[PDB]
Every structure is written in structure tokens, then in C-alpha cells.
Write a protein that binds this DNA or RNA. Structure first.
Ligand SMILES: Cc1cn([C@H]2C[C@H](O)[C@@H](COP(=O)(O)OP(=O)(O)[C@H](Cl)P(=O)(O)O)O2)c(=O)[nH]c1=O
Ligand SMILES: [Cl-]
Ligand SMILES: [Cl-]
Ligand SMILES: [Mg+2]
Ligand code: NA
Ligand code: NA
Length: 326
DNA sequence: CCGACAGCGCATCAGC
DNA sequence: GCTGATGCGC
DNA sequence: GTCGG
């Protein structure tokens, strides 16, 4: 990409803040500046040029100047020399291994991919699966494969009940050419806001996708969220597709637009939009938008008939999913 | 000069 | 086993 | 680490 060196540097700094420092706001800060720079259709030539962009303040500006001048950041080279941090940075790339498990592993002398394989009895189920598919889960999903997965999922939910609705969200719905996982929003006029004629709806759908061997593994399961692993069928004589992460969310119908807003993101967009909602006197979660009182108590859920209605309350112009790629 | 920084679902662990 | 906190991931 | 107040 055009400013790929700068956004790589910021992402590496961000990974350090998340994985090692656990400095969440510094993580998001590096991450926000990385987002707006990758989006800027111009070759950044100095830190001052970048300091014109939102999210880029003094210290990211200075780090841009250092990186432009040298190809490097001393901070990053020092982190890369730190064995504990670097081991932690690697181990947190396994799905299910965060900073706590990472440094637990490192103190146990477990710090490599093959260390993990030798001590698999030390991993919980999520971590075992993350290790099993580690190479797979480093691979992104071409949009063309996302279309095939979408075809399978949307038809299968119709097979369980023809009035299920399934919307593939996340980066795919913002039009990305590749995606990290598959995010499937699901609902049914049976299910309205927690007035349940009887649940088990998500399990029914998961059952069916397991039955056709699309879902191959389970990471988490509740009444509203399933996390697991799935795989496209291969044709005879031919290399398997990589296994893929999948998240399916079952949401009440009267909450569909909040659900699809949230599940479409991006995460930075969601954080920004939700912050502006607080500034305007509302709170937005995946289910509802509510008013806030002076003392902060949330009101009752507001009517929503579209994504645009949510933008209207907080006095934003509607943004197509493709322009929410923050 | 400093405090805010989104909001949630599910799994597991520590202590009882 | 439960509560409540922590961990990890959308 | 940035931003807004
Ligand atoms: C991680 C995260 C996600 N979301 C919402 C917004 C997200 O859009 C939605 C999907 O989460 P995802 O992790 O799959 O994000 P994505 O956009 O699909 C990624 Cl670019 P990729 O999967 O293609 O690699 O969940 C949040 O609201 N807060 C969050 O902290
Ligand atoms: Cl570097
Ligand atoms: Cl709610
Ligand atoms: Mg996704
Ligand atoms: Na991970
Ligand atoms: Na996801």
C-alpha cells in the first residue's frame, strides 16, 4: 500500500501496547492513526504532513519522522531485542492466547509453536483449536471465498426455516476484498425482544451447519453467540481450503438494525460512533440505542427501522458500510 | 493541564 | 457447585 | 497517545 511502511510501524507499536503493555488506549491511539493514514490517498513525506490528520498527534508525528529518516524505530528495535516481550508477541498470535496465558507459558519455558505442540495438555479448548489451525488462521479469506461461504450459510439457515434472515457483516459487508473471519448476523420473526415462544434457535442453525460439515469446530456457544471454525468443501483431488473462523450472532428482529450496525463495524468506527452518541446524550450497543439521563441512567429503547435512523438520533450523516472502514 | 477513552458474550479461574 | 473477577474475543 | 474542554 501507499503508506504501508508507516502503517506497519504503527501496527507493530499497537500490537506491543495491546499484547505486552496492556495499554489499551495507546493501542487504540496507534490503531486510529494507522487507520487514517492507510486511507489517506497521498504519500506521507513528513510527520508534520501526517499531524494534519486526525488521530496523529505529536509523538506519532515524531515517530513518523524517525521512521522516514532511518527506515526504523529505536523503540521497535529494542522491543524486538526483548526476549520476554517478543515471545509474548508471538504467542498471542495463537487464537485464545492473550497476554496472561502468554506470560504463563513463557515462565513455563513454553515460547515457540513447537513448544505449544509438545505441551498441548496445558492449553484450554479454545487454545488447542487456535494451535491446530494456527497456519490456517494466519491466512485471510479472499472475498470470492466469502461469497461461497455466504451462499452455503444463507441457504442452510433457509433449510432449517425459510424465514430466517442471515446477513454477512464485518469487513465483507464493508466491501473488503479479503476478510479475517466470517461474521453472520441471524434473526427470525419468531424471536422478538426476549419474548421467547422458546429459544434454541441458534443451536438449531449450528446443528445443521455441523451436519453438512461446514462448521468443523466449536469455540463458544450461548443463546446469542456462536464462535467456531468452518471450511469450504474442496473438489475431488484438490487441496483443502484453509479452515476459517466464524462468528454467528442471533439477535431479536426489532433489534436488527442495531445488530447490523454493530456487526458491520469497523471496531474503530463503532468506538467513534458510540463515543459521539455519548456526546449527544445516547448509548448505542448491539441491541438498542437509548437516551441517557443527567445522572447517566439509560432510558428505554428507541424505535429503529433502519441503520440511518440510528445515525439520525446522534445527528450524523448516514455512512455506507464501505465508508465505515476505519 | 488533565480526564475520557464503547460496549458487549462467553469460558475459565480463584476462593469459598 | 456458586459468585465474582479475570481473560479473551467480537 | 490524542483530543477536547
Ligand atoms: C473487535 C471488535 C469488533 N466489533 C464489531 C465491529 C466489527 O466489524 C464486528 C466484527 O468483528 P471482527 O473482528 O470480525 O471485525 P472485521 O471488521 O470483520 C475485521 Cl476487519 P476482519 O474479521 O475482516 O479481519 O464486530 C466491535 O464492535 N468491537 C470490537 O472490539
Ligand atoms: Cl523497526
Ligand atoms: Cl440493551
Ligand atoms: Mg470479521
Ligand atoms: Na490471539
Ligand atoms: Na468476528
Amino acid at each position: 500500500t501507499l503508506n504501508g511502511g508507516i502503517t506497519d510501524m504503527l501496527t507493530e507499536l499497537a500490537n506491543f501496547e495491546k499484547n505486552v503493555s496492556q495499554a489499551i488506549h495507546k493501542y487504540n491511539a496507534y490503531r486510529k492513526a494507522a487507520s487514517v493514514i492507510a486511507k489517506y490517498p497521498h504519500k506521507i513525506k513528513s510527520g508534520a504532513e501526517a499531524k494534519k490528520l486526525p488521530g496523529v498527534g505529536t509523538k506519532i508525528l515524531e515517530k513518523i519522522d524517525e521512521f522516514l529518516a532511518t527506515g526504523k524505530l529505536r523503540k521497535l528495535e529494542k522491543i524486538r531485542q526483548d526476549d520476554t516481550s517478543s515471545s509474548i508477541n508471538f504467542l498471542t498470535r495463537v487464537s485464545g492466547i492473550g497476554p496472561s496465558a502468554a506470560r504463563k507459558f513463557v515462565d513455563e519455558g513454553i515460547k515457540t509453536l513447537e513448544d505449544l505442540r509438545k505441551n498441548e495438555d496445558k492449553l484450554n479448548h479454545h487454545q488447542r483449536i487456535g494451535l491446530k489451525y494456527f497456519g490456517d488462521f494466519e491466512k485471510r479469506i479472499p472475498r470470492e471465498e466469502m461469497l461461497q461461504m455466504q451462499d452455503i450459510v444463507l441457504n442452510e439457515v433457509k433449510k432449517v426455516d425459510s424465514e430466517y434472515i442471515a446477513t454477512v457483516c464485518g469487513s465483507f459487508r464493508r466491501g473488503a476484498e479479503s476478510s479475517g473471519d466470517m461474521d453472520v448476523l441471524l434473526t427470525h420473526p419468531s424471536f422478538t425482544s426476549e419474548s421467547t415462544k422458546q429459544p434454541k434457535l441458534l443451536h438449531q442453525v449450528v446443528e445443521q451447519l455441523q451436519k453438512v460439515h461446514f462448521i468443523t469446530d466449536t469455540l463458544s456457544k450461548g443463546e446469542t453467540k456462536f464462535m467456531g471454525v468452518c471450511q469450504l468443501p474442496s473438489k475431488n483431488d484438490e487441496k483443502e481450503y484453509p479452515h476459517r473462523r466464524i462468528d454467528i450472532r442471533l439477535i431479536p428482529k426489532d433489534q436488527y438494525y442495531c445488530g447490523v450496525l454493530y456487526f458491520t463495524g469497523s471496531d474503530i468506527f463503532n468506538k467513534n460512533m458510540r463515543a459521539h452518541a455519548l456526546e449527544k446524550g445516547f448509548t448505542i450497543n448491539e441491541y438498542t440505542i437509548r437516551p441517557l439521563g443527567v445522572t447517566g441512567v439509560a432510558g428505554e429503547p428507541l424505535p429503529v427501522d433502519s441503520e440511518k435512523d440510528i445515525f439520525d438520533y446522534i445527528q450524523w450523516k448516514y455512512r455506507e458500510p464501505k465508508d465505515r472502514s476505519e
